[PDB]
Amino acid sequence: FRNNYDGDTVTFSPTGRLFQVEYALEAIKQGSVTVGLRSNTHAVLVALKRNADELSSYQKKIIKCDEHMGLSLAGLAPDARVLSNYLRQQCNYSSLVFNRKLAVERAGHLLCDKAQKNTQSYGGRPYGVGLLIIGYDKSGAHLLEFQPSGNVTELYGTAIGARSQGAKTYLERTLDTFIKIDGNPDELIKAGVEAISQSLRDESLTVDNLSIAIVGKDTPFTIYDGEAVAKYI
Amino acid sequence: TSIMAVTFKDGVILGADSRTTTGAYIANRVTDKLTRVHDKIWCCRSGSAADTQAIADIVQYHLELYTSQYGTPSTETAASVFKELCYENKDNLTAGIIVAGYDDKNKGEVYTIPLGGSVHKLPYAIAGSGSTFIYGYCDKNFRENMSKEETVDFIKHSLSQAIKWDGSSGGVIRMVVLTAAGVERLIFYPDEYEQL
Amino acid sequence: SDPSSINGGIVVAMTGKDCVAIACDLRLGSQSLGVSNKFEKIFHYGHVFLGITGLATDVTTLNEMFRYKTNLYKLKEERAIEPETFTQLVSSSLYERRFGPYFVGPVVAGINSKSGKPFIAGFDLIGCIDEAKDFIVSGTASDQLFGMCESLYEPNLEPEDLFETISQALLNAADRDALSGWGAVVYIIKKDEVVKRYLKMRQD
Amino acid sequence: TTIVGVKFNNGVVIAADTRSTQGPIVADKNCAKLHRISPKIWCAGAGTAADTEAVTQLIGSNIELHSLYTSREPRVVSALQMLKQHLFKYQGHIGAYLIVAGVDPTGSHLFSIHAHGSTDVGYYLSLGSGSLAAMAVLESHWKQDLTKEEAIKLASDAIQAGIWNDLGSGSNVDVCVMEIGKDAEYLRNYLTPNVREEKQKSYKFPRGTTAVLKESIVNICD
Amino acid sequence: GSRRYDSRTTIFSPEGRLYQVEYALESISHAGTAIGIMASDGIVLAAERKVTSTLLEQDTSTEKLYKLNDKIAVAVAGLTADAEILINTARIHAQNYLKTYNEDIPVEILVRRLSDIKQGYTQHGGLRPFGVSFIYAGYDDRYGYQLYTSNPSGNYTGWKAISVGANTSAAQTLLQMDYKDDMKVDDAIELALKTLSKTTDSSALTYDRLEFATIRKGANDGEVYQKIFKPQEIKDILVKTGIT
Amino acid sequence: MTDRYSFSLTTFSPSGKLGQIDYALTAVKQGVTSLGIKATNGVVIATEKKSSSPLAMSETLSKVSLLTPDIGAVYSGMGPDYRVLVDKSRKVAHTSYKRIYGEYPPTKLLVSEVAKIMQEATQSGGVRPFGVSLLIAGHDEFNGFSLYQVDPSGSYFPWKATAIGKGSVAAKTFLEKRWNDELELEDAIHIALLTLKESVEGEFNGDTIELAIIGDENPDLLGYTGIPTDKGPRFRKLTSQEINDRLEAL
Amino acid sequence: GTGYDLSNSVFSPDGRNFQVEYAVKAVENGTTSIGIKCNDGVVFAVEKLITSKLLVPQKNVKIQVVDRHIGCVYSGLIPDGRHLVNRGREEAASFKKLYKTPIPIPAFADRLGQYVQAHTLYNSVRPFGVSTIFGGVDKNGAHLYMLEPSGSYWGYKGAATGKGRQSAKAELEKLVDHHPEGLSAREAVKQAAKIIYLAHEDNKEKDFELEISWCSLSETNGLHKFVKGDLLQEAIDFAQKEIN
Amino acid sequence: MDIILGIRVQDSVILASSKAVTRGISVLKDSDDKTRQLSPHTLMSFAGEAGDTVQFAEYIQANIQLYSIREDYELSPQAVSSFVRQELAKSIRSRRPYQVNVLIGGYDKKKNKPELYQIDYLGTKVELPYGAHGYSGFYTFSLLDHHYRPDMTTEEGLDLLKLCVQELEKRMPMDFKGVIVKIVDKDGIRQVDDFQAQ
Amino acid sequence: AGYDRHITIFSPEGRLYQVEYAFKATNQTNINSLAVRGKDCTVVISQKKVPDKLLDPTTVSYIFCISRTIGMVVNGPIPDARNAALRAKAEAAEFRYKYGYDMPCDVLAKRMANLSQIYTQRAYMRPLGVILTFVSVDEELGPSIYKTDPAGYYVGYKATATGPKQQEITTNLENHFKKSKIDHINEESWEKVVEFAITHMIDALGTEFSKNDLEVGVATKDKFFTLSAENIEERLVAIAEQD
Secondary structure, eight states, X not given: OGGGTOSOXXXXXXXXXXXXXXXXXXXXXXXXXXXXXXXXXXXXXXXXXXXXXXXXXXXXXXXXEETTEEEEEEEOHHHHHHHHHHHHHHHHHHHHHHSOOOOHHXXXXXXXXXXXXTTXXXXXXXXXXXXXXXXXXXXXXXXEEEOTTSOEEEBSEEEESTTHHHHXXXXXXXXXXXXXXXXXXXXHHHHHHHHHGGGOOSSOOOTTTEEEEEEETTEEEEEEETHHHHTTO | OOEEEEEETTEEEEEEOOOEEETTEEEESSOOOEEEEETTEEEEEEEOHHHHHHHHHHHHHHHHHHHHHHSSOOHHHHHHHHHHHHHHTGXXXXXXXXXXXXXXXXXXXXXXXXXXXXXXXXXXXXXXXXXXXXHHHHHHHOOTTOOHHHHHHHHXXXXXXXXXXXXXXXXXXXXXXXXXXXXXXXXXXXXXXXXX | OOGGGTSOOEEEEEEOSSXXXXXXXXXXXXXXXXXXXXXXXXXXXXXXXXXXXXXXXXXXXXXHHHXXXXXXXXXXXXXXXXXXXXXXXXXXXXXXXXXXXOOEEEEEEEEOTTTOOEEEEEEOTTOOEEOOSSEEEEETTHHHHHHHHHHHOOSSOOHXXXXXXXXXXXXXXXXXXXXXXXXXXXXXXXXXXEEEEEEOOOOO | XXXXXXXXXXXXXXXXXXXXXXXXXXXXXSOOOXXXXXXXXXXXXXXXXXXXXXHHHHHHHHHHHHHHHHTSOOOHHHHHHHHHHHHHHTTTOSOEEEEEEEEETTEEEEEEEOTTSOEEEOSEEEEETTHHHHHHHHHHHOOSSOOHHHHHHHHHHXXXXXXXXXXXXOSOEEEEEEESSSOEEEEEEEEOOOOOOOOSSOOOOOTTOSOEEEEEEOOOOO | OOGGGOOOTTXXXXXXXXXXXXXXXXXXXXXXXXXXXXXXXEEEEEEEOSSOOSSBXXXXXXXXXXXXXXXXXEEEEEOHHHHHHHHHHHHHHHHHHHHHXXXXXXXXXXXXXXXXXXXXXXXXXXXXXXXXXXXXXXXXTTTEEEEXXXXXXXXXXXXXXXXXXXXHHHHHHHHHHHOOTTOOHHHXXXXXXXXXXXXXXXXXXXXXXXXXXXXXXXXXXXXXXXXXXXXXXXXXXXXXXXXX | OOOOOOSXXXXXXXXXXXXXXXXXXXXXXXXXXXXXXXXXXXXXXXXXXXXXXXXXXGGGOOSSEEEETTEEEEEEEOHHHHHHHHHHHHHHHIIIIIHHHSSOOOXXXXXXXXXXXXXXXXXXXXXXXXXXXXXXXXXXXXXXXXXXXXXXXXXXXXXXXXXXXTTHHHHHHHHHHHOOTTOOHXXXXXXXXXXXXXXXXXXXXXXXXXXXXXXXXXXXXXXXXXXXXXXXXXXXXXXHHHHHHHHTTO | OOXXXXXXXXXXXXXXXXXXXXXXXXXXXXXXXXXEEOSSEEEXXXXXXXXXXXXXXXXXOOOEEETTTEEEEEEEOHHHHHHHHHHHHHHHHHHHHHHSSOXXXXXXXXXXXXXXXXXXXXXXXXXXXXXXXXXXEEXXXXXXXXXXXXXXXXEBSEEEESTTHHHHHHHHHHHHHTOTTOOOHHHHHHHHHHHHHHHGGGGTTSXXXXXXXXXXXXXXXXXXXXXXXXXXXHXXXXXXXXXX | OOOEEEXXXXXXXXXXXXXXXXXXXXXXXXXXXXXXXXXXXXXXXXXXXXXXXXXXXXXXHHHXXXXXXXXXXXXXXXXXXXXXXXXXXXXTTSSSOOOEEEEEEEEETXXXXXXXXXXXXXXXXXXOSEEEETTTHHHHHHHHHHHOOTTOOHHHHHHHHHHHHHHHHHHOSSOOOOEEEEEEETTEEEEESOOTTO | OGGGGTSSOOXXXXXXXXXXXXHHHTTTTOOOEEEEEOSSEEEEEEEOOOXXXXXXXXXXXXXXXXXXXXXXXXXXXXXXXXXXXXXXXHHHHHHHHHHSSOOOHHHHHHXXXXXXXXXXXXXXXXXXXXXXXXXXXXXXXXXXXEXXXXXXXXXXXXXXXXXXXXXXXXXXXXXXXXXXXXXXXXXXXXXXXXXXXXXXXXXXXXXXXXXXXXXXXXXXXXXXXXXXHHHHHHHHHHHHTXX
């Protein structure tokens, strides 16, 4: 079975699966955990940076795409770079040509369409990375989950990566609670850190290990690392 | 060259002179400037003969393929193809085309595509060097919903004048009647229209 | 300015009785300055002869080109090209550069090895074939040559006679042209042999 | 150049003079301006010589190949469509003006084509610097329903108007008749009204007249 | 994708060999034998026509000896069609060289170019190599008489006498046995015919099954002459040497 | 999309064979028999019109094609491959020869052109060799009459007479017996008809046979008159009638 | 042998293209969606599985519009569906640009048709993992279509695909019989909401979200518009009622 | 223009080339060597457009040298000039032609005879006893047409040049700052460092 | 090795399996069709089968109008059939444009056949699993029927049939012609020719037809058109009053 239908993306299995795409998804899981949640005024990204050695850094997992948009990555870093960069251009284009900030919903459509291309043509490989996009546009706070399959979804909150299932259940519970953390950033963040810890196990989120990013009504997407997050550990 | 297309109660009529010149010499005195792009969509050509013939030929091609796939095209669509060619290649074309077609729903329709490549839908349209001389007359004598016989007269008189003053025009006056009845070819010789 | 008048030169060809003659001058100058007195303008590929007047660089380029084409032709065809055929090759080769021509005026002369018939032809710079039975002229002194030929020519001349006629046609025309002369060479061609003589002419 | 085309009750005929010129000098006193596009489709061309020649052969080539592909006789309208689209493409830079005629499975046809790619249809046509002299004649004698012999006369006369009245035309008259049922008949030098009178003297030179400096045999054999 | 049907014709075997070349050579080994012997006054090219019939037109035929230039000719062993492709491009290179330098192309220069083309299909492109081996017989004013040989690999070398095609090992030994530096064209002509005669996979060595050519500098002249023997000429020389 | 078959589909096997060329030949072996005989003043090529249904019109299917007015071809193998080959051949005759020299190509060269086309379908990326063998008969001023056979490998050879297809072996033998360098065109036409009869199971007449010749010029098939040098095509396909007449003298 | 199912353009011994068939599997495994043609327009509706409470309601839209009069809905690999619409969108713009008039539904159908069929011709591309239901109102009526991964498509009175295509089709067939005079835009909108609810049983495990859109010459002026608020609730209830 | 002279005597070829390099109103250099050695026995002098001049020369130099190493052989002067002509002949019909005129003088070791080639930027080649490019030719052709004999020794050749160079200094409007002379014979190429007063 | 069954290369026996399998696909729709020549027209009958009740019957067809004069009926899957139709239309339009006259039926066939022959030799393009029957009343050849297959083969018929039960229809027709001794239906009106066609279609298939079981196309001088449910019904009633 599978072994004969997983040689490349252009092949369908007898049941209708695209194993290469599936194996790509498998790289997301092996990736460190990250979480995103939004109220009606803000949206927050809390990502757990992973380290190789105790002599190595905790590889950055949050990329800014424009003053009003950003995302967190879980999987192959290079692929996130490629994709984030593409998004940065789409945002830029929208501004320069139409003097309009790119709708988060539309950024999602662009990401889906770009990924889909690497799953129908010979030679290419799917993207091996998951993305969580947050942003404040002409219709408020937004949170998007991007899967290499090409499937992009808008949620109130969510998480991806290893043990990501913990945070996701926690948020599926805390829903009614954080969704109302309007006007208060520090609360939405804390609410996020309390979701990300729901997927810990190995250690505890240190200072040079925690990474948070936020955007909203009067907050240009910004990223906090280290001392900046100390007050959240 | 003097050409015109007039919409009336039962459809539409296209008329033209039959003179093509290269300088003061009349290369052809029995020219047929009334070209068929489709069964019930014809056009009047003015300007570069080479250009208008080539343009027409390409349009006829497009409408023939259009028909193969989507049935009979509207007169508006025929106009859009001419327009697309004239506009897009404005720098290398010298064509003034009048497009006239007969629809069963829209009855008669006339579109004029001047030099720029812009499109104009009108009750009737006149074009060609001779047209300048009959702007006054045509404006004063045109009425909507005229009868076939009336319209054939309007065109016949107008063109006879255009031919009278413009040296680039002359020969015979050809016409094409487009109605639900089908297609009718008309011709009028000098001896008749000169003394109108 | 006019490429066909930078270097100067003339070529003429005539048909006789079972023979053909082709002659040219030896001048090669640059405007008024004469430079070479040995620049010949007649070449041959097998038994087919070609004379090229016009821009020197093109005269040379075309010869090299035709040597090239005739060589391959023989390797494939396994026989040397005939006047008629070569003429067609010249024509198409020239028109191939229709919008950036060679500034030459070619003349073909030879006898069909199969039918023994004499053959001469001329073309303009873009290749239009001018096939004449009597004579073909070309060069900066072409008007003079037309004058000489039209008068001094008569059918079926014999090799020794055609020679006298062609040489007098070339010689006297070249002398009414500031850009031609400075030497001259005539080719008398027959089925079995070909003689090449250098004429003695004014050196001014 | 002077070329004409005349339709007659059962076909069409085309004629042309035989003078070729470079500036005011006559280069060829008898060249053939009548070209065969296909066995029964002939073409008469004026304008840039090399152009009418090349364009004529090219389309002739394609017509032949098209004939073999479709297993049908070539149609004049096809030679007409190919010729014009080719000429148009070149914005008039290929100075070829032609009168194309012939008979095919659909009847007898007469057309004219200009270097820019525009085409005309008619019962009688003329092109060339002799165009007007000829057209004057045609506009004076043409009538509907001409017999093959009447057409040949009318055409032959039109080309003459050119020879005599136009400096760009002269020498002989060539004709080609295409009749709906038979083979096309080419009539090279159907008229030769300009034979040069015998020269007042002979200019044959006494051998030895020309001074030679060197001599030698040339190697033709490889 | 298509990667599934790709034979990867340009890869190395674990032993550092090129499969396709090796197999192409294997193909060449069943081709009619061709021999080239270089003497002091000329070169001789003899070849055995693989398969023939009574009805085969030998007059108009040629399948082993091709003229490249006027001073260079080749003997073929392998796919005739493949050979013709290379022959023609070879002929062009000669002409370019001429048109460029107004001098005939030196024999090795032409041989290297052709061999380089072959080497190409060996290292890139994913196409099969040419199933051809050539014996080049030429003359130039720098090395005079020369004999070369090239094969599918794109490798080429020079010889005094050499063979290609079928039974080369046998033919080479026989040649290495009776060749003498001071030889003469007529001698080589005979050596050549004998060699073929002893390696043929046929009953007898008749004229109808041969192609013969010599490149001499005909004393009464001073230039080089290529002669491609006609059926009749072969039949004679065949009897004379004593093979009737 | 995009042809990602940029590699050869025909390669050398360890044995030295080029499989696809071999198989293409096998395909030819199955094809209906066809032959060609060269006389002293003409050549004749003929084959069987194996109608694939009594409802089909055998005429709308010529196995014998004119390439130039003095060259004709016939085949054995996959008809479709032949059809496109004839097209390419007819065209190359112009593009590479008539348009350059103003005259149609001599038989050997045109054959050489066809052979080239076929050779390439043996090495170019992503293609299979042609499944046909051709017999091309023609005449040119400096080479007279000639007959050639072109194989899928791209190889071609000149013949006095030969046959390809189904019963080629048998037919080739029958030819060796009846051929001689003094045969007149009619003698060959006769011999041709005989050899072909052995390879035909059913009806043997002018409607089940296709035969053409390369002989004298037919000024009657020229289409026009007025040019002495133009005498007419040497290639002529025999009519169903002209065949039967010779069948009664069989 | 076997393996006829590993390359996309390959024909199996029985004349099939297994890769296309495998694509269908991916389609059948997807959400259910339908289309109902009425007397002057068409209605589209699709099931939207609520994977979790985190899915912002009403946000993740699925139905798409092409130009201004075409509505498209599909079952299977969503990304592939978007891809096909992007094409259709260009396909439509191109048509309008040249002919001025907005593209006729049938004409549009073949555009998608030809494009999809195209992805079954080469092994360098994968077939589409979606079945699409689309339609609209044009110069002469309303048209409903369904396109298969094979590129095959036909005009329908009612159409459905996805997990519960059978429940749906069953229902649809009833409607066709019990309304030989023609359903109405208002009617179809509710009827659709019901059929989605019924067909949701073959997935009754997860909760879903309804989504409808329509194009009616009278109700929307021939333009494609989504069913929202009141009219949506009214239809949601009409179903919620008959589900019991 | 600049002065470019070439003269073929009995067993050698002599090339005289002006030393001045002027741009505008200033004479920038007075020791310019308007020559390049293509091979041990082939020398090429050149004159023309400011940049094209050297660029072309060096380009041709590189090719000949590459040929020499590839074939381990020296191309005959005839062959080299044929190569150079073809280059110029290609150039003339290119986007921006090389505006350079050259004189190629070499000693053919196979024929044991010196050769002089004149080729202008159009690709016009011709072999001569003596040649020149530019306005110089207007004074030197008749000068040599008078004082020239084929059997002249290299020494007689240098005196013949001096005679030319003197005529040029007398009548030419420009100050070309003298010339540099070089001899090409069976023993290679050498430069006469004493012509500033020989 | 065994890949000689997946791509278009020769099998040791010299066969091209992919082309053979392509032929297999042409029967997938289980429809039969036949064409016959009138005195001055050409008729094509084809079974029309509409299984689903949800289908708009008016959109189900395997008969196409290629040009004002050419009609083509396909035997095989619809997506391939539509692909072939669009190409044929395109090809016919361009021909007229470039050559100045309507592309003849036989030529369009040869052209389409050639295109198919290419999918036979070049690997990356798969053959189309369809058989194309072209019809018209050529301005030079009169009534014409030309058919092409995945092999790239093509020929003209006096009449022909295609589909699963193709053989019974063929022998039926063969016999009728052995009898009539002529190569066509000696009828003046196409109405009677269409009837003849539908008639022999029944005799061979041993089945009765309703106005919605058939699909008819007629080619006449300067026009090829298809019949309506009613036009057919009228034809059915006519043959009803004879049996």
